[PDB]
Amino acid sequence: MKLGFVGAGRVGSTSAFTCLLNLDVDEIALVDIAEDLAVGEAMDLAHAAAGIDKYPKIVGGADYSLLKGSEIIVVTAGLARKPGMTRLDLAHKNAGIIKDIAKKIVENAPESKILVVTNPMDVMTYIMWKESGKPRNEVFGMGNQLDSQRLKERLYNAGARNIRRAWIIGEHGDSMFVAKSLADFDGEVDWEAVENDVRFVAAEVIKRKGATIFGPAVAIYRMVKAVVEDTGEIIPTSMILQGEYGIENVAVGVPAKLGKNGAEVADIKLSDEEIEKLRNSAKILRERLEELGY
Amino acid sequence: MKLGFVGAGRVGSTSAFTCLLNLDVDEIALVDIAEDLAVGEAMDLAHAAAGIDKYPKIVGGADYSLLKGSEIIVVTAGLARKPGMTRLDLAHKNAGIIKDIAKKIVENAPESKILVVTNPMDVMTYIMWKESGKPRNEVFGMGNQLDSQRLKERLYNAGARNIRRAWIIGEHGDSMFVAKSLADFDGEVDWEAVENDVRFVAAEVIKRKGATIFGPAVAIYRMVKAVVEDTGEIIPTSMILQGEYGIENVAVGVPAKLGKNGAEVADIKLSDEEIEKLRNSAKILRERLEELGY
Ligand SMILES: NC(=O)C1=CN([C@@H]2O[C@H](COP(=O)(O)OP(=O)(O)OC[C@H]3O[C@@H](n4cnc5c(N)ncnc54)[C@H](O)[C@@H]3O)[C@@H](O)[C@H]2O)C=CC1
Ligand SMILES: NC(=O)C1=CN([C@@H]2O[C@H](COP(=O)(O)OP(=O)(O)OC[C@H]3O[C@@H](n4cnc5c(N)ncnc54)[C@H](O)[C@@H]3O)[C@@H](O)[C@H]2O)C=CC1
Numbered sequence A, B: 001m002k003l004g005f006v007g008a009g010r011v012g013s014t015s016a017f018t019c020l021l022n023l024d025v026d027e028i029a030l031v032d033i034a035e036d037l038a039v040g041e042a043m044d045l046a047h048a049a050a051g052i053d054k055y056p057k058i059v060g061g062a063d064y065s066l067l068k069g070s071e072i073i074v075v076t077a078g079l080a081r082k083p084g085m086t087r088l089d090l091a092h093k094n095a096g097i098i099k100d101i102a103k104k105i106v107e108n109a110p111e112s113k114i115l116v117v118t119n120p121m122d123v124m125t126y127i128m129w130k131e132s133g134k135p136r137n138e139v140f141g142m143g144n145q146l147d148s149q150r151l152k153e154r155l156y157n158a159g160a161r162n163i164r165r166a167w168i169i170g171e172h173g174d175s176m177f178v179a180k181s182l183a184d185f186d187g188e189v190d191w192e193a194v195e196n197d198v199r200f201v202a203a204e205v206i207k208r209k210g211a212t213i214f215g216p217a218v219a220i221y222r223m224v225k226a227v228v229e230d231t232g233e234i235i236p237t238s239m240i241l242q243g244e245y246g247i248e249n250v251a252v253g254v255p256a257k258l259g260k261n262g263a264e265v266a267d268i269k270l271s272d273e274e275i276e277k278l279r280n281s282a283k284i285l286r287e288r289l290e291e292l293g294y
């Protein structure tokens, strides 16, 4: 089991840490244009590793060669943004970097599953699958999981208990929605209040903490776990749809089955209103992609 | 089980994360002069928590009240430094903050074990024990563990295998040394090379990565684990000595026994040369304390 990480920033490195803490990993690789940053992350992860009596190979640098062998690669590389500076501006910039990465991931680690995390995730996930020759089952994105984690919290807060299932699907962003039809938990809650908090929690945290890290790392871990350990679990995942729910040619968050073969749309029936909400999100995402020449 | 954290900076927050990932914790508290920073860390840890189906109480702020109840408190609060700016300058500054914290920890969470991490750890550990009424068994410092983790790595690198024990003791800093007399592992290694790498690894990482985080978090976790779970383990810990090895009135790193009662000098015989190296470190630390009016 080798894990690959393109981007050794806050989320890349904490993701890798989390995985190291809970998975039987033999090798971890960290690629990043910031060469020294990637090496130092590697060094620090190794020191961490030695304290739980794990001793895997942890290499860090800037050559995509390091990725050779990876069963899966978490791509967090790019830029987050703010200081006024535009949404679409980063979309272009990152889209440039994502296209560029896919090419490198393919001429180095051809057979690796690719987990896209870089924002706007649904959009970058699509661009990744498009720019690499790969089948829609070897490229997907982390987002909804994290959204759902937030959901599961606001619920336990609002009284809910024995939360067996609770997901958020659709766009990882504004047009997201709770899949009420699948909620399973004891205790009455206010779906109004809850649906609301979640969407704006993302930035409520960013303005205070500076960025979102620990939430994202765990979500990423849960996905990687499901693949490296062939658990067969079902996790809201951003996936290229080719017909499902009347949607096509776009990535969007839908319940998926993760396992050694990557991801596959878990066929699960949704509310009639739930399909529209999904179709809306696809439209919005489809707009944003055409904006980019895809 | 409540964990308290004074300082929600890089190490405080990643420590708390690590603990959340591996301990059955009911409440986590994060105090920091940066109020919003502490809240955001709390929020993010909670989102993280929900993804491993843990749902503890995580509160964050600036009032030391949040600490009430803590079985143990990890203190990472202060400043790290560089841009030229002097060693001793921070020692004074942090010593001011540490004295100030001890008072608050005592009039809020009287019965809590206190884990000192803020650098120069051995020095702050002593100042903490002095400024709080507390017995030398309820205040100690994390350092040698982390040093040892690094050690265990450079060894596995140099061939060593089945490393059953391998510690670094003495000052957490320049006058540290390997306790060769207790090393236990298959394979010949070069004690020259190894002893050397370790001391300067700390900053080799800092210049690249920016700071040391994941190493420190795990070390801190291993200590907290041993206490909250009464494991009785023996871990190089920075401790106030009152006679042991011919040393007194100073904190320094010696093999210790951690358990529900905190820490106690594990009585372990050391090489004759090993005692001198320890006594030297005590002298250096004793100098640095008198420099501070202690
Ligand atoms: N999908 C999700 O749920 C979440 C996504 N994210 C996103 O992931 C991205 C990373 O966030 P952070 O970790 O905070 O970023 P950082 O913490 O800013 O990480 C970015 C790293 O990417 C590297 N990089 C930039 N260009 C590169 C290139 N051409 N090739 C290789 N490496 C390159 C940088 O050197 C940097 O270290 C952001 O877009 C952020 O919004 C963040 C949280 C959650
Ligand atoms: N003993 C060890 O092995 C290690 C010790 N450290 C040390 O721990 C300290 C923390 O490192 P970082 O996490 O990187 O620092 P940060 O990442 O700079 O964390 C410091 C936090 O302390 C807070 N703070 C400052 N003054 C305070 C006060 N009077 N009351 C409450 N909070 C206050 C700050 O707001 C800040 O968030 C440093 O001194 C560093 O050298 C770091 C690594 C290892």
Ligand code: NA
Pocket: A232, A257, A258, A259, A260, A261, A262, A263, A264
């Ligand atoms: Na599968």
Ligand code: NA
Pocket: B232, B257, B258, B259, B260, B261, B262, B263, B264
């Ligand atoms: Na004990």
